[PDB]
């Protein structure tokens, strides 16, 4: 897993994209690179011991979607360090650094049944106060919980479900 | 043209990267200009793509990253043949005696495969060394291997000097001396002794001195073996002297540690017994020629059990054990007659005469060892009239095994002696059978042949 | 999966332009600082062993040249350093002041004066790391270097150009013997060098004070790497000392170098290796710790007169040079099998074994003769000492063979009891007080007294007073014979007759 | 201005802006909840990260806390104001009295005095202990070390040396408790306070309850006060309660600092971490420090790397052994291993030296006979080896002594034996003038007259 070795590359790519006000182009470029990493044949080549400046060039060849200077340079650095497989995580941490920079968040709302669209309005209004960030919502439905709602925002959760109330009563006794 | 570049230098270990077509094979030799001076690297491993890890055969200091490296497309190969007699060479076959270019006609790679079991011939021609005790107690055939075991200061190196001199002067045989991990003082002593004794023009010398990287000290044994094999293929009977196996094994331990291999029984490389078998199995008597070998082997801390001497034993055909106690009493060669042994000491090969004489001597000394402590506690005047005779004859036998060497003349000024096997058996049999009960003990000390004991007694 | 100095802004620089211009292969920037090792980024033209120059006036030695890093060790206090500092590669290797003017000075491993007596008067600089003279440039060692100890000079001779290991457990006289070997040269024509690795400074101050009391300090160089100095300055100190001894060797003079506890240079080098992440060997020592000591000790050589003429460009003709080494090793619980002793016992030409049982039992210097060896042997002795030591060797060998019965000695026959009580007396004869070195005339006189049976009737308790009385007697009545032996070492029927007469008349007329 | 990014046991990793990264040994600070935690940085890793050791309980630290960079090393009160008061490793007062009125504060990381400034002294120091100042006399301004296993006497001996040297000495004194029992620290503090000598002693305590950073730096905190008193021109006593804990605390943290293990799991920098401390505890031309150090040896193994590297840094080494304590012979000093740089004919005179070497020779000769006695019994000794053995046992007894600080154990009153009065007794026992007395006449007595007087009662 590359959660840790991806942090420096995502941070460098984001700090560069900001200087040039191209964050969106960089995100799409990384999203394409992290896809070419997943192809059946390319994932074979990435594992075999090729010399870095050969693997990097064969990888560059498969992408005209990369602005020839700054995206290809990132590919060449990651290739020199032997980390092209880390791109699918560079993408996630780039999206994270962006969401932080623009003060945005994305809340999952899980319920036994879909909400009335006034509840959703008040939920978003409330969370945009719990968090400084402008919040999207993704409503989701799960009939294990049977009343109330779960609000999950990052690693924080608010366990408003009655299922939670029951399991939390059982353990008082 | 030069097609590689250095990418790491960590001590003696250098990494070089080539385009993935031109990757050198293992054991290939590379070359680079370390300043105004050339340096050659031996490939040890092909790892990853294009990169190759090597051991420098020389001073690693002064290497930059990114130097151009040129790959010779052959292993380290050395000059061979008659041109090398009387010269000194390092592991790369360059002269280090300042007499200039070698004059080679042919070069051989030092890495080659051992003779098949199909090509060997068993032979039982006993070498005659001219040393009383080694000839009597530890006979060895052509194509055999002999190990001189002992601590420090017992006489391995001068015993090998004397064997070289005797074989070169009495039998005019060619010899090769591989100074694995040589002490430069001893190498200079050896050179001057061989030129003074006038044998140098029948010995070719290879020196990997101690002050050199591990790879030199490891591959010098193979350079010497390659010269010996070139002489063998001419149909000769060469004799190969390895000045210490123990330093061959330490050089292997160093090399293995540098490459980062996982260590084994007492810090020894994992490949110990395979390096030893690669060395020792090229020394054999083929149908075309023969390589005999004498090998000094230091036993550290007297234990005989740590992996180095423990693994050498599997290959030797005879063992001569030297003790410092015997040496301190002043009876050089200092060979212990009761612990030294040979696989060839049986009547079918040495004949009942020699076998009987050797077992007789061992029996007399083994009985004297019994009697020593009765002599200590009860005094000698209490011994039987037969036991006092056994004591006198054991003491005379014990004196008569000592001998003055031609190369020890620098130590004591006494002139050296060469003693045939016939005179050895005749003398020891005469002693054991009472023919000399009338001579004093000291008439046998450092005497040489038995007639010289009667010539000496008159002077006493 | 762990990073290798791929860090945010260095990566961003490459994003901006991957093929960065070749702005300067001459310089780089510190990226790490810890335990005296710094990692340098850049320095494309660094060479292994090269001196790198830091802010202030400080240097580092480039030891690891890797893919995008140089690992270098700071030769001094490192805590001042900080990430991001700029650094330059000098084209140089480490050099040290060298010359005759160092005699009588105390200097640290960089040759800076540390005794406070003012600036050095060196004759130029010499590289610390140098190759030893080849096989063809040596000459056989056949000149004695006198320690003044009856135990050593008779039975374990040291010759000019030898390398004699002193090895033993803690507190057994390893330093006392080595420093008596230096004091005795006060008027011998041999320059001395004493390099102290990892010792506490107030011990060096004390041995320098003893060298100053006796006449020895004006003839010796002291090189100090105290316990608080960084590992690099302890690991390089022996090479700094050898480079100063080679100044004399290469010019037709004789020198003697005493490396104090090389077993503490091996530990400094182990620290440096383990901090640079190098593969640990046995006891965690690095792989090339044999190659560390081997290329140090192979510099102690005797060089023939032709090498000296070629070196000094004709200025000195017909003189051999020499450098003698006396490395010291410490063995924990008598274990000579450990990784460091088992290498240095294999490199050297001899071994002096100091044993704590003899040291406690009163035998000082506590040399063990049945296990010590000198491979040069009689070639390094004056012929009188060579003649007279032959009987001491066997007198002690037979005693070692009979020793077991010492605890049953009442039972023994008188024929062996004489051997046993002669061995005890010659063993009592080799004891000697500290800082009392004997000239060859006195050693030969006492060993003659012992060999020819004159101690056959002296009681074991009185051997020391016998020896002292004999030397005092001889110093007044027969001063000319001593002055002859000391000057020539010869041994003739005449010398033997005169010695026989001295012993007869002394044992007749004097008392002890 | 920095963030925590890892917390592994006692070591904390902090991330700073690239231009603000602290220097090595600078001290940081964190608000560990309702607490203030001081971190001392050990390494500058790359990229603005820095690796630190916590001077306090590491529990409760979250990631992402905010740490403040104090731009100076740890600094302790020092000088006359710190006298008679107990202090933390951080120099904070630990007794319930008020603030320390110090005028000046010193950083605890310092360079050793130059080789030029050192001084050497032959002036012998006298103690009430027979065996110590016979076999291993030590001198004013020099180092002493007591080596022993667990529970053999190296604290009782140090309290006796305190009693015999420190009350009868005019200058100030410093006692550093490094990783030993807090019970003993309280006992010592109250003994001093109840005998009204506390106003001449400065106490630093970093006992075994505390986390590794405190045990790691408390010894330097004590050396800094001893060094201040030294440089003022005074002459000082420095007692260290167990210096082994100072390297053990380094071994506990080493692997977390990411360093490869050495011979027996010890840090690779053992000898340097030990030398950098012991090279600054020395006397100099401007003033002198006399120091006694207890040195624990693990598993009674005197060849373990830590005692083995410590031996070289001491002038007089006193080695205590369990096989002697189990005989009830206290102090359990092993006279065939105790030694001193001062034992020379030039320093202690010929009579003292000659008696010491005679004692060693007899006791070693007795050691050589212990196997034949074990197998064949004592009746097989020659008529004079029995005499050697009897005198050796009498000497073994006579080296025992009662201590004023051991009355709590044996009830017997302490004895103070002058040197003149002990070399005479040992000359007597060796020369044979006391063969008539039984062995037990010598056990636990002072001068020799007490032995001849004790024989009358059996
Ligand atoms: N020939 C001698 N006669 C009497 N005493 C001696 C003799 N040689 C040394 N000693 C004493 O032995 C003690 C230890 O000697 P020394 O310090 O030389 O040993 P060492 O091996 O260097 O110890 P360390 O390992 O601590 O350096 C010294 O105090 C010295 O006085
Ligand atoms: N036969 C001999 N005659 C005289 N001296 C000898 C003899 N054999 C050995 N020696 C002495 O032993 C010393 C070392 O012997 P050497 O063979 O070098 O020992 P090692 O086997 O350890 O190399 C030499 O200096 C020499 O003086
Ligand atoms: N002089 C002495 N007299 C009597 N008993 C003693 C003496 N010295 C030590 N002991 C005993 O040894 C025990 C060990 O205590 P201590 O000296 O504190 O060991 P440690 O050195 O580990 O602290 C003491 O509690 C006491 O029982
Ligand atoms: Mg040899
Ligand atoms: Mg010493
Ligand atoms: Mg205690």
Domain end marker among B344, B370, B386: B344
Domain check: are D351 and D327 in the same one?
A: no
Domain check: are D53 and D94 in the same one?
A: no
Domain check: are D294 and D410 in the same one?
A: no
Domain check: are C210 and C341 in the same one?
A: yes
Q: List CB contacts of D267: < 8 A, sequence separation 6 or more.
A: D247, D250, D251, D254, D259, D261, D273
Residue nearest to atom 16 of ligand 3 (CA): D153
What CATH number is associated with residue A45? 1.10.520.20
Domain end marker among D289, D307, D342: D342
Domain check: are D380 and D320 in the same one?
A: no
Do residue B17 and residue A51 have CB atoms under 8 angstroms apart?
Answer: yes
Q: Is C105 in the pocket of ligand 1 (CB under 6 A)?
A: no
- Whether chains A and C touch (3+ CB pairs under 8 A) is answered by yes
Catalytic residue among D105, D181, D386, D415: D181
Write out chain C residues lying below 8 Å of A5, CB-based: 1-3
Q: Is D80 in the active site?
A: no
**Could you say which ligand is closest to the alpha carbon of residue D240?**
6
Do residue B11 and residue C288 have CB atoms under 8 angstroms apart?
Answer: yes
What's the CA angle centered on C401, arms C397 and C403, to 5 degrees? 110
Contact D423, D352 (CB under 8 A): yes
Nearest to A13 among C4, C15, C17 (CB): C15
Report how far ligand 5's centroid is from the alpha carbon of C199 (Å). 9
Q: Is C393 in the pocket of ligand 2 (CB under 6 A)?
A: no
Q: Is B121 in the pocket of ligand 2 (CB under 6 A)?
A: no
In sequence order, what DSSP letters do the residues of B404-418 get, joined into one string? --SSTHHHH-PPP--
The CA distance from D100 to D87, in Å, is 9
Nearest to C287 among B258, B377, B380 (CB): B258
The CA distance from A62 to B49, in Å, is 22
Q: What CA–CA distances, in Å, run from B344 to B125, B149, B159, C285?
A: 10, 18, 21, 44
Nearest to B263 among C282, C302, C343 (CB): C282
Q: Is D235 helix (H, G, I), strand (E, B) or coil?
A: strand
The CA distance from D242 to D157, in Å, is 13
Domain end marker among D302, D318, D342: D342
Q: Is B170 in the active site?
A: no
In the DSSP assignment, the letter for residue D44 is: B
Q: Is D155 in the pocket of ligand 3 (CB under 6 A)?
A: yes
Domain check: are D86 and D146 in the same one?
A: yes
In sequence order, what DSSP letters do the residues of D140-174 get, joined into one string? TT-EEEEEE-TTSSTTHHHHHHIIIIITT--S-EE
* Two tokens, residue C305: 């007169």
Domain check: are D444 and D404 in the same one?
A: yes
Domain check: are C174 and C69 in the same one?
A: no
User: Closest by alpha carbon to B246, among B187, B158, B307?
Assistant: B307
- Whether chains C and D touch (3+ CB pairs under 8 A) is answered by yes
Q: List CB contacts of B116: < 8 A, sequence separation 6 or more.
A: none
Strands (E), B172-217: 175-182, 203-209
The CA distance from C13 to B450, in Å, is 90
Other residues' Cβ atoms within 10 Å of the Cβ of residue B11: 21
Q: Ligand 1, from C150, C153, C176: best to mutate by most atoms within 8 Å of Cβ?
A: C176
Domain check: are D384 and D397 in the same one?
A: yes
Which atom of ligand 2 is closest in space to residue B332's alpha carbon?
1
User: Closest by alpha carbon to D141, among D126, D122, D127?
Assistant: D122
Q: Ligand 2, from B147, B151, B155: best to mutate by most atoms within 8 Å of Cβ?
A: B155
Q: Is D179 in the pocket of ligand 3 (CB under 6 A)?
A: no
* Count of domains for chain C: 3
Q: List CB contacts of B241: < 8 A, sequence separation 6 or more.
A: B160, B163, B164, B175, B176, B177, B178, B293, B294, B295
Q: Ligand 1, from C167, C170, C171: best to mutate by most atoms within 8 Å of Cβ?
A: C171
Domain check: are B297 and B370 in the same one?
A: no
Domain check: are C260 and C376 in the same one?
A: yes
Tell me whether strands A149-153 and A104-111 are parallel, antiparallel or unpaired: antiparallel
Q: Is D327 in the pocket of ligand 3 (CB under 6 A)?
A: no
Q: What CA–CA distances, in Å, run from B389 to B214, B383, B395, B441, B442?
A: 56, 10, 10, 12, 16
What percentage of chain A's residues is helix, strand, coil (to nearest 5)? 55, 15, 30
Signed CA dihedral, C330, C332, C335, C340: sign only: negative
Query: Which residue in this structure is represented by tokens 């008598």?
Result: C334
CA closest to C61 among chain B residues = B61
Report how far ligand 3's centroid is from the alpha carbon of C303 (Å). 62
- How far, in whole angstroms, is CA A73 from its chain's centroid? 23
* Two tokens, residue C273: 């290796």
C-alpha dihedral, C122 to C128 to C131 to C132, nearest 10°: 60
Q: Ligand 2, from B133, B149, B158: best to mutate by most atoms within 8 Å of Cβ?
A: B158
Domain check: are D328 and D357 in the same one?
A: no
Q: List CB contacts of B35: < 8 A, sequence separation 6 or more.
A: B62
Domain end marker among C381, C411, C432: C381
Whether B20 has its CB under 8 Å from any CB of chain A: the answer is yes
Contact C405, C413 (CB under 8 A): no
What CATH number is associated with residue B251? 3.40.50.300
Query: Which residue in this structure is represented by tokens 């762990």?
Result: C2
The CA distance from D409 to D159, in Å, is 14
Q: Is C66 helix (H, G, I), strand (E, B) or coil?
A: strand
* Count of domains for chain B: 3
Residue nearest to atom 3 of ligand 2 (CA): B408
What's the CA angle centered on C269, arms C267 and C271, to 5 degrees? 70
Domain end marker among C92, C126, C153: C92
Q: What CA–CA distances, in Å, run from C458 to C377, D363, D431?
A: 31, 26, 22
Domain check: are C363 and C345 in the same one?
A: yes
Contact C352, C165 (CB under 8 A): yes
* Two tokens, residue C177: 């013997």
The CA distance from D124 to C306, in Å, is 57
Summary count for chain B: helices (H), strands (E): 13, 16
Between chain A and chain B, the number of residue pairs with CB atoms below 8 A apart is 10
Domain check: are C372 and C419 in the same one?
A: no
What CATH number is associated with residue D17? 2.40.10.170
Nearest to C6 among A1, A8, A15 (CB): A8
Between chain C and chain D, the number of residue pairs with CB atoms below 8 A apart is 153
Q: Which residue range is the domain that position C114 belongs to?
A: 93-381
Domain check: are B87 and B66 in the same one?
A: no
Which atom of ligand 2 is closest in space to residue B159's alpha carbon?
17
Q: Which residue range is the domain that position A84 belongs to?
A: 6-100
Whether A9 has its CB under 8 Å from any CB of chain C: the answer is yes
Report how far ligand 6's centroid is from the alpha carbon of D300 (Å). 14
Beta-bridge partners for D288: D235
Contact C277, C66 (CB under 8 A): no
Report how far ligand 2's centroid is from the alpha carbon of B422 (Å). 27
Domain check: are B35 and B100 in the same one?
A: no
Buried-exposed string C44-59: b where 16+ CB fall within 10 A, e elsewhere: bbbbbbbbbebeeeeb
Domain check: are C49 and C107 in the same one?
A: no
Tell me whether strands B175-182 and B203-209 are parallel, antiparallel or unpaired: parallel
Selected residue of A47, A48, A51 to mutate for chain B interface (largest B Cβ count, 10 A): A51
Which atom of ligand 3 is closest in space to residue D403's alpha carbon?
1
Write out chain C residues lying below 8 Å of A15, CB-based: 8-9, 12
Q: Is D453 in the active site?
A: no
What CATH number is associated with residue C154? 3.40.50.300
The CA distance from D12 to D22, in Å, is 14
Cis amide linkage into residue D100, ω under 30° from 0 = no
Buried-exposed string D393-430: b where 16+ CB fall within 10 A, e elsewhere: ebbbbbbbbbbebbeeeeeeebbbbebeebbebbbebb
In the DSSP assignment, the letter for residue C150 is: H
What's phi and psi for D96, nearest 5 deg?
A: -80, 10
**For chain D, first and last CA: distance in Å?**
78
Domain check: are D60 and D90 in the same one?
A: no
What CATH number is associated with residue B388? 1.10.1140.10
Write out chain D residues lying below 8 Å of C205, CB-based: 115, 118, 120
Q: Which chains touch D (3 or more CB pairs under 8 A)?
A: C
Write out chain A residues lying below 8 Å of B17, CB-based: 51
Q: Is D61 helix (H, G, I), strand (E, B) or coil?
A: coil
Domain end marker among C92, C116, C151: C92
Q: Which residue range is the domain that position D2 belongs to?
A: 1-73
Selected residue of A73, A83, A86 to mutate for chain C interface (largest C Cβ count, 10 A): A73
């Amino acid at each position: 897993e590359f959660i840790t070795v991806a942090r420096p590359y995502a941070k460098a790519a984001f700090d560069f994209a900001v200087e040039h006000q191209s964050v969106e182009r960089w995100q799409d470029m990384l999203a394409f690179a992290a896809e070419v990493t997943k192809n059946e044949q390319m994932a074979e080549l990435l594992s075999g011991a090729l010399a870095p400046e050969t693997l990097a060039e064969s990888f560059i060849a498969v992408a005209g979607e990369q602005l020839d200077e700054n995206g290809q340079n990132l590919i060449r650095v990651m290739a020199e360090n032997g980390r092209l497989n880390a791109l699918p995580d560079v993408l996630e941490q780039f999206i994270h650094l962006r969401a932080v920079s623009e003060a945005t968040a994305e809340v999952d709302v899980i319920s036994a049944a879909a909400l009335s669209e006034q509840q959703l309005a008040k939920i978003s209004a409330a969370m945009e106060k719990r968090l400084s960030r402008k919040v999207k919502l993704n409503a989701k439905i799960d009939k294990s919980v049977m009343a109330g709602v779960i609000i999950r925002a990052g690693d924080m959760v608010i366990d408003g479900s009655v299922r939670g109330r029951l399991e939390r009563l059982a353990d008082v006794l | 043209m030069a097609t590689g570049k250095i990418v790491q230098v960590i001590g003696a270990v250098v990494d070089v990267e080539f385009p993935q077509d031109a990757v050198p094979r293992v054991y290939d030799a590379l070359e680079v200009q370390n300043g105004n001076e050339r340096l050659v690297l031996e490939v040890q491993q092909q790892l990853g793509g294009g990169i190759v890890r090597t051991i420098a055969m020389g001073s690693s200091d002064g290497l930059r990253r990114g130097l151009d490296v040129k790959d010779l497309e052959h292993p380290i190969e050395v000059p061979v043949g008659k041109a090398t007699l009387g010269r000194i060479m390092n592991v790369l076959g360059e002269p280090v005696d300042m007499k200039g270019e070698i004059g080679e006609e042919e070069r051989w790679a030092i890495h080659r495969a051992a003779p098949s079991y199909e090509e060997l011939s068993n032979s039982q021609e006993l070498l005659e060394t001219g040393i009383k005790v080694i000839d009597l107690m530890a006979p060895f055939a052509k194509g055999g291997k002999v190990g001189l075991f002992g601590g420090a200061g017992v006489g391995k190196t001068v015993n090998m000097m004397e064997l070289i001199r005797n074989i070169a002067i009495e039998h005019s045989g060619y010899s090769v001396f591989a100074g694995v991990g040589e002490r430069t003082r001893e190498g200079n002593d050896f050179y001057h002794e061989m030129t003074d004794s006038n044998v140098i023009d029948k010995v070719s010398l290879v020196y990997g001195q101690m002050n050199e990287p591990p790879g030199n000290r490891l591959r010098v044994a193979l350079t010497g073996l390659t010269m010996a094999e070139k002489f063998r293929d001419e149909g000769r009977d060469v004799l190969l002297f390895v000045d210490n196996i123990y330093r061959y094994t330490l050089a292997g331990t160093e090399v293995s540690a540098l490459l980062g291999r996982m260590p084994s029984a007492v810090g020894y490389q994992p490949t110990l017994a395979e390096e030893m078998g690669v060395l020792q199995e090229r020394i054999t008597s083929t149908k075309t020629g023969s390589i005999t070998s004498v090998q000094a082997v230091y036993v550290p801390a007297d234990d005989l059990t740590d992996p180095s001497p423990a693994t050498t034993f599997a290959h030797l055909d005879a063992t001569v054990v030297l003790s410092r106690q015997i040496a301190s009493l002043g009876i050089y060669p200092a060979v212990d007659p009761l612990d030294s042994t040979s696989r060839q000491l049986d009547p079918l090969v040495v004949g009942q005469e020699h076998y009987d004489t050797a077992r007789g001597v061992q029996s007399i000394l083994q009985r004297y060892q019994e009697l020593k402590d009765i002599i200590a506690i009860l005094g000698m005047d209490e011994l039987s009239e037969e036991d006092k005779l056994v004591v006198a004859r054991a003491r005379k036998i014990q004196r008569f095994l000592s001998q003055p060497f031609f190369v020890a003349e620098v130590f004591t000024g006494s002139p050296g002696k060469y003693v045939s096997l016939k005179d050895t058996i005749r003398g020891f049999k005469g002693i054991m059978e009472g023919e000399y009960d009338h001579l004093p003990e000291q008439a046998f000390y450092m005497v040489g042949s038995i007639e010289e004991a009667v010539e000496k007694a008159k002077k006493l | 999966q762990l990073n290798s100095t791929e860090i945010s802004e260095l990566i961003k620089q490459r994003i901006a332009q991957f093929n960065v211009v070749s702005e300067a292969h001459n310089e780089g920037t510190i990226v790490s600082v810890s335990d005296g090792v710094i990692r340098i980024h850049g320095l494309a033209d660094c060479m292994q062993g090269e001196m790198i120059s830091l802010p202030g006036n400080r240097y580092a030695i480039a030891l690891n040249l890797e893919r995008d890093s140089v690992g270098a060790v700071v030769m001094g206090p490192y805590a001042d350093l900080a990430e991001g500092m700029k650094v330059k590669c000098t084209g140089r290797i480490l050099e040290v002041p060298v010359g005759r003017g160092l005699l009588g000075r105390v200097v640290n491993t960089l040759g800076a004066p540390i005794d406070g007596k003012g600036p050095l008067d060196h004759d130029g600089f010499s590289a610390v790391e140098a190759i030893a003279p080849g096989v063809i440039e040596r000459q056989s060692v056949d000149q004695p270097v006198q320690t003044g100890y009856k135990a050593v000079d008779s039975m374990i001779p040291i010759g000019r150009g030898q390398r004699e290991l002193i090895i033993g457990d803690r507190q057994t006289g390893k330093t006392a013997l080595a420093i008596d070997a230096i004091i005795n040269q006060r008027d011998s024509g041999i320059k001395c060098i004493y390099v102290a690795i990892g010792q506490k400074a107030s011990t060096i101050s004390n041995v320098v004070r003893k060298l100053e009391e006796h006449g020895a300090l004006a003839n010796t160089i002291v090189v100090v790497a105290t316990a608080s100095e960084s590992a690099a300055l302890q690991y390089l100190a022996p090479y700094a000392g050898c480079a100063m001894g080679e100044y004399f060797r290469d010019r037709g003079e004789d020198a003697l170098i005493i490396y104090d506890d090389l077993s503490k240079q091996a530990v400094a080098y182990r620290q440096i290796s383990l901090l640079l992440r190098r593969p640990p060997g046995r006891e965690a020592f690095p792989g090339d710790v044999f190659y560390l000591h081997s290329r140090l000790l192979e510099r102690a050589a005797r060089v023939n007169a032709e090498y000296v003429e070629a070196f000094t460009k004709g200025e000195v003709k017909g003189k051999t040079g020499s450098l003698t080494a006396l490395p010291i090793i410490e063995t924990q619980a008598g274990d000579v099998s450990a990784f460091v002793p088992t290498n240095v016992i294999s490199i050297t030409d001899g071994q002096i074994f100091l044993e704590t049982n003899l040291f406690n039992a009163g035998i000082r210097p506590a040399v063990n003769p049945g296990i010590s060896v000198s491979r040069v042997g009689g070639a390094a002795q004056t012929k009188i000492m060579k003649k007279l030591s032959g009987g001491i060797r066997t007198a002690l060998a037979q005693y070692r063979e009979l020793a077991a019965f010492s605890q049953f000695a009442s039972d023994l026959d008188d024929a062996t009891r004489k051997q046993l009580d002669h061995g005890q007396k010659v063993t009592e004869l080799l004891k000697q007080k500290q800082y009392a070195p004997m000239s060859v005339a006195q050693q030969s006189l006492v060993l003659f007294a012992a060999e020819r049976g004159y101690l056959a009737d002296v009681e074991l308790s009185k051997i020391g007073s016998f020896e002292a009385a004999l030397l005092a007697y001889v110093d007044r009545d027969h001063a000319p014979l001593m002055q002859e032996i000391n000057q020539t070492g010869g041994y003739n029927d005449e010398i033997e007759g005169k010695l026989k007469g001295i012993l007869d008349s002394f044992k007749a007329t004097q008392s002890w």
